[PDB]
Design a protein around this ligand. Structure first.
Ligand SMILES: [Mg+2]
Length: 124
């Protein structure tokens, strides 16, 4: 589990993107880039050669479940594991997201400890 998979962090909230960049940094992961909406993650995704996606749900460009679908449907990208960060903790929301192919889930707030527990287990 490389402290160096290249990770895309998607969220319409810059402070959120950076609270996340640092807990990842605390964890041994530095290689990170950001995107503020799914509409602007995909073309990053499409040729950036990433290894892992962490994305929010609530985004207005392209909501996060939609990005996940475009990923699952792009043949070059559907092998990517996606951790989803959540805003609104509902069992009807999670179901729909597992149904769309998400690898794991996490609920805000979260800590660098709930985070690794979530990591050790996607690559699972
Ligand atoms: Mg959001």
């Amino acid at each position: 589990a490389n402290k160096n998979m290249k990770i895309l962090i998607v969220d319409d909230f810059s402070t959120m993107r950076r609270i996340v960049k640092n807990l990842l940094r605390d964890l041994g992961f530095n290689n990170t880039q950001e995107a503020d909406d799914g509409l602007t993650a995909l073309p990053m995704l499409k040729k950036g050669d990433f290894d892992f996606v962490v994305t929010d749900w609530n985004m207005p460009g392209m909501q996060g479940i939609d990005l996940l679908k475009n990923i699952r449907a792009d043949e070059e990208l559907k092998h990517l594991p996606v951790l989803m960060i959540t805003a609104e903790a509902k069992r009807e929301q999670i179901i729909e997201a597992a149904q769309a192919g998400v690898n794991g889930y996490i609920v805000k707030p979260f800590t660098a400890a709930t985070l690794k527990e979530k990591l050790d287990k996607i690559f699972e």
